[PDB]
């Protein structure tokens, strides 16, 4: 049956959920670190004058 | 005296003609394509009367 | 015997939920409370593309961040030069009914997934100047909801049939098939490393597949309705997902839980397209509210509103360098914002 | 920008071709085709053609028709039928012989009630408000041959007519047309067809023409 496949998947997914059982605090820290570090190269966050934006130029 | 008659005896028939052209164009295109024939809108059609 | 397998299966989903609960030290808001607000965003329209007559349905940015492919409900694929609003190419599509379009990373090819279950690849750099039709990819037994270029030789296609597929273009064979989904795969997104991708189906479940083996590495739930759009976070550790419940959710890959929710009482209609800006700080979600929304990716707060279309937003796309965001809507105009 | 003038030339030529093809397509009429499995849509599509998505092209005194056969899609109709919103006709084909048939791989759901349920889901869907439904009560002959013995009460327990063909098919038409709730705006063009050279192409032409004229009279607010 297909259910034996479903379980054969879900158990494996559990094993990945155990390796990927890193704390949500770490994921939050990584997301925040990327957002802070790659800031200032966000043309939408910080607008750039007409001298460099290609859609007014 | 001239302007009153010249407007009253002409805008009536301009409105008649425009109305009939509206009906005629809509119906005699309906049998031919789905697109609404141009210049039939209720507002802009008045401009045909003023022309 | 079948009930016995059902009991194991949900014996392990219970353990999975427990494992997901073990990681949840605090939500994203409790740590991001100290982040400075982005500020009110006054992004304005800079370009309006008077192209297709009927309806825009999909839009993708070229890797050059200049060429822009757009697709219509009936008619042709229009490739624009976004800087000067020129029409570089017009592709006279064989099958009118379109649902997705994709632009190759090298720029040599484009693809229209189409609703006729046949992915059509078009070669642009042809000797005779005309856009030719290369090997069409057939055999997906369902409407192609989304197609994405792995590279000039590999494409990933999502179908109304629950099976996602990977095609080798020279021979057209369905060289890999992913079947873990139970519902119709509405949306698909490729991670920046291209090593793996994610897709969301009507079963309110997103699954993270890898292209080399095909095994479903992870599944994510939490949405109460169909998943219609998914966009990978630029770094690749997370992905945001829109749904008909009008709530964007930012799932994490190295983690396994919700981690965020983007909803507000003022908006009811479901989301239709999500696209993280470069650097990942802004999430731009189009709605059926005749509107688009700029959410803070770290704080569950609205950063700005675009509100510049007359019909439903078909799709959103942020340039690879983040210079501007193209919003294609159900009104025939495609508007570029920054 | 000495070379970009040629780029603008290409853009203008492409825009011209775009507009010509767009007006050519907006000239034509788009007709949906949908119904239950084995509803006899094959016979209907064969008659109009003699005169994934399967597109069929036919002409009947200009007004060139493009017909879209959708039955081929076993998928989520909710996320697919948001297309076809600009069709000026929705040809619904249902076989009256379905009243007698208990099953279509669907838990002994009578094929007629399955067809009515699909009709209810598609007619009242809020995408389709101005699109008009053309109802083909197909296989009128096989219905006339079946009703002579097997009472319609097996399908419609509240029916109290004499099982005579006219009093039965009129009831099926009445029920299907009463199934349309938003009758203020929508119109149901019920017709009876069978596997013979009927006026079904002429009837489609007439219903489409009337719906086109109705739409245009709404455009100017005359209706």
UniProtKB/Swiss-Prot annotation, chain A:
Q: Which domain of life is it from?
A: Eukaryota
Q: Which GO terms describe its molecular function?
A: G-protein beta-subunit binding
According to UniProt, the name of this protein is Guanine nucleotide-binding protein G(I)/G(S)/G(O) subunit gamma-2
Record's bilayer topology term:
Lipid-anchor
Task: Identify its protein family.
Answer: Belongs to the G protein gamma family.
Give the main localization category: membrane
Q: Which organism is it from?
A: Homo sapiens (Human)
Spell out the subcellular localization from the entry.
Cell membrane
Name the UniProt key words of this record, in alphabetical order.
Acetylation, Cell membrane, Host-virus interaction, Lipoprotein, Membrane, Methylation, Prenylation, Transducer
Curated annotation (Swiss-Prot), chain B:
| Tissue/organ expression | Strongly expressed in the cerebellum. Expressed at low levels in hippocampus, hypothalamus and thalamus. No expression detected in liver.
> What do we know about how this protein assembles, alone or with others?
Interacts with PICK1.
Main function: G-protein coupled receptor for glutamate. Ligand binding causes a conformation change that triggers signaling via guanine nucleotide-binding proteins (G proteins) and modulates the activity of down-stream effectors. Signaling inhibits adenylate cyclase activity.
Its protein name is Metabotropic glutamate receptor 4
Record-stated family: Belongs to the G-protein coupled receptor 3 family.
Localization per record? Cell membrane
Which regions face the Cytoplasmic side of the membrane?
Answer: 22-45
Q: Where do transmembrane segments lie in this chain? A: 3-21
List the source organism.
Homo sapiens (Human)
UniProtKB/Swiss-Prot annotation, chain C:
- So which domain of life are we looking at? Eukaryota
Does the keyword section mention Disulfide bond? no
Disease affiliated with this protein = Intellectual developmental disorder, autosomal dominant 42: A disorder characterized by significantly below average general intellectual functioning associated with impairments in adaptive behavior and manifested during the developmental period. MRD42 patients manifest global developmental delay commonly accompanied by hypotonia, seizures of various types, ophthalmological manifestations, and poor growth.
Q: How is it modified after translation?
A: Phosphorylation at His-264 by NDKB contributes to G protein activation by increasing the high energetic phosphate transfer onto GDP.
The similarity comment for this entry is:
Belongs to the WD repeat G protein beta family.
This protein's name: Guanine nucleotide-binding protein G(I)/G(S)/G(T) subunit beta-1
MF terms from GO for this chain are: GTPase activity; GTPase binding; protein-containing complex binding; signaling receptor complex adaptor activity
Gene Ontology BP term (one): retina development in camera-type eye
Give, from the UniProt record, the effect of changing residue 94 to L. In MRD42; decreases receptor-driven G protein activation; decreases trimer formation with alpha and gamma subunit; no effect on protein abundance; no effect on complex formation with gamma subunit
What are the protein's UniProt keywords?
Answer: Acetylation, Disease variant, Host-virus interaction, Intellectual disability, Phosphoprotein, Repeat, Transducer, WD repeat
Placement of WD repeats on the sequence? 44-92, 93-138, 139-179, 180-221, 222-265, 266-307, 308-338
- Phosphohistidine, modified sites: 264
Curated annotation (Swiss-Prot), chain D:
Q: What is the effect of changing residue 30 to A?
A: Decreased affinity for PLCD4
Q: Per the record, which residues fall in region G4 motif?
A: 134-141
* A GO MF label: metal ion binding
Stretch list, region G3 motif:
65-74
ADP-ribosylcysteine-modified residues are 220
Question: Which residues are listed for Mg(2+) binding in this entry?
Answer: 42
Relate the outcome reported for changing residue 121 to D.
Decreased affinity for PLCD4
Where is this protein chiefly located? cytoplasm
Describe the location of the G-alpha domain by residue ranges.
27-223
Report the Gene3D superfamilies cross-referenced here: GI Alpha 1, domain 2-like (1.10.400.10), P-loop containing nucleotide triphosphate hydrolases (3.40.50.300)
KW Lyase (keyword) present: no
Question: What InterPro entries does UniProt report for this protein, alphabetically?
Answer: Gprotein_alpha_I, Gprotein_alpha_su, GproteinA_insert, P-loop_NTPase
Subcellular location as annotated: Cytoplasm; Cell membrane; Cytoplasm, Cytoskeleton, Microtubule organizing center, Centrosome
Stated consequence of mutating residue 84 to A? Decreased affinity for CCDC88C and PLCD4
Q: Where is this region: G1 motif?
A: 30-43
Relate the outcome reported for changing residue 37 to R.
Answer: Decreased affinity for PLCD4
- Which effect does the record note for changing residue 121 to A? Increased affinity for PLCD4
Which of this chain's residues are annotated to bind GDP?
38-43, 138-139, 141, 194-195
For this protein, the record's PROSITE patterns field holds: G_ALPHA
PTM notes: (Microbial infection) Deamidated at Gln-73 by Photorhabdus asymbiotica toxin PAU_02230, blocking GTP hydrolysis of heterotrimeric GNAQ or GNA11 and G-alphai (GNAI1, GNAI2 or GNAI3) proteins, thereby activating RhoA.
Spell out the family assignment given in the record's similarity comment: Belongs to the G-alpha family. G(i/o/t/z) subfamily.
Q: What is this protein called?
A: Guanine nucleotide-binding protein G(i) subunit alpha-3
The organism named in the record is Homo sapiens
Its gene is: GNAI3
């Amino acid at each position: 049956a297909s259910i034996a496949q479903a379980r054969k998947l879900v158990e494996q997914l559990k094993m990945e959920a155990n390796i990927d059982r890193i704390k949500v605090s770490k994921a939050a820290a990584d997301l925040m670190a990327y957002c802070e570090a790659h800031a200032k190269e966000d043309p939408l966050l910080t607008p750039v004058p007409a001298s460099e934006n290609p859609f007014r130029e | 005296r001239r302007i009153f008659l010249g407007l009253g005896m002409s805008i009536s028939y301009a409105a008649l003609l425009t109305k009939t052209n509206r009906i005629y164009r809509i119906f005699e295109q309906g049998k031919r394509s789905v697109s609404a024939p141009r210049f039939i809108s209720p507002a802009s059609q008045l401009a045909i009367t003023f022309s | 015997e079948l009930d016995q397998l059902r009991q194991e299966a949900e014996q392990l989903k219970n353990q999975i939920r427990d494992a997901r609960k073990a990681c949840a030290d605090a939500t994203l808001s409790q740590i991001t409370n100290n982040i400075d607000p982005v500020g009110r965003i006054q992004m304005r329209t800079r370009r309006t593309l008077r192209g297709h007559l009927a309806k825009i349905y999909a839009m993708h940015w070229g890797t050059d961040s200049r060429l822009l492919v757009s697709a219509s409900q009936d008619g042709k694929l229009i490739i624009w030069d976004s800087y000067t609003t020129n029409k570089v190419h017009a592709i006279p599509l064989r099958s009118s009914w379109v649902m997705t379009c994709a632009y190759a990373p090298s720029g040599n090819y484009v693809a229209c997934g189409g609703l006729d279950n046949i992915c059509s690849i078009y070669n642009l750099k042809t000797r005779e100047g005309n856009v030719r039709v290369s090997r069409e990819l057939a055999g997906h037994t369902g409407y192609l909801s989304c197609c994405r270029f792995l590279d000039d030789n590999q494409i990933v296609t999502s179908s109304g049939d629950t099976t996602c597929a990977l095609w080798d273009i020279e021979t057209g064979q369905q060289t890999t098939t992913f079947t873990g989904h139970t519902g119709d795969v509405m949306s698909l997104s490729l991670a920046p490393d291209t090593r793996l991708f994610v897709s969301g189906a009507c079963d309110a479940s997103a699954k993270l597949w890898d292209v080399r083996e095909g095994m479903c590495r992870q599944t994510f739930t939490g949405h109460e309705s169909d998943i219609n759009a998914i966009c990978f976070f630029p770094n690749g550790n997370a992905f945001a997902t829109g749904s008909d419940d009008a709530t964007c959710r930012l799932f994490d890959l190295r983690a396994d839980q919700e981690l965020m929710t983007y909803s507000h009482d003022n908006i009811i209609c479901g989301i239709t397209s999500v696209s993280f800006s470069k650097s990942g700080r802004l999430l731009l979600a189009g709605y059926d509210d005749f509107n688009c929304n700029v959410w803070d990716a770290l704080k569950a707060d609205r950063a700005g509103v675009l509100a510049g279309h007359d019909n439903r937003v078909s799709c959103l796309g942020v340039t690879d360098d983040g210079m501007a965001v193209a919003t294609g809507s159900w009104d025939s105009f495609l508007k570029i914002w920054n | 920008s000495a070379e970009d003038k040629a780029a603008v030339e290409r853009s203008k030529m492409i825009d011209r071709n775009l507009r010509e093809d767009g007006e050519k397509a907006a000239k034509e009429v788009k007709l949906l085709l949908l119904g239950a499995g084995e509803s006899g849509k094959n016979t209907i599509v064969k008659q109009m053609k003699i005169i994934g998505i399967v597109e069929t092209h036919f002409t009947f005194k200009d007004l060139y028709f493009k017909m879209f056969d959708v039955g081929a899609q076993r998928s989520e109709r909710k996320k697919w039928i948001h297309c076809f919103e600009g069709v000026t006709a929705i040809i619904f084909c249902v076989a009256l012989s379905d009243y007698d048939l208990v099953l279509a791989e669907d838990e002994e759901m009578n094929r007629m009630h399955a067809s009515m349920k699909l009709f209810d889901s598609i007619c009242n869907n809020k995408w389709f408000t101005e699109t008009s439904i053309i109802l083909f009560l197909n296989k009128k002959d096989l219905f006339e041959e079946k009703i002579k013995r097997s009472p319609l009460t097996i399908c419609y327990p509240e029916y109290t007519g004499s099982n005579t063909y006219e009093e039965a098919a009129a009831y099926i038409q009445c029920q299907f047309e009463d199934l349309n709730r938003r009758k203020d705006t929508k119109e149901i063009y019920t017709h009876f067809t069978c596997s013979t050279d009927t006026k079904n192409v002429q009837f489609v032409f007439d219903a489409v023409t009337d719906v086109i004229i109705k739409n245009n009279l709404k455009e100017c607010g005359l209706y």
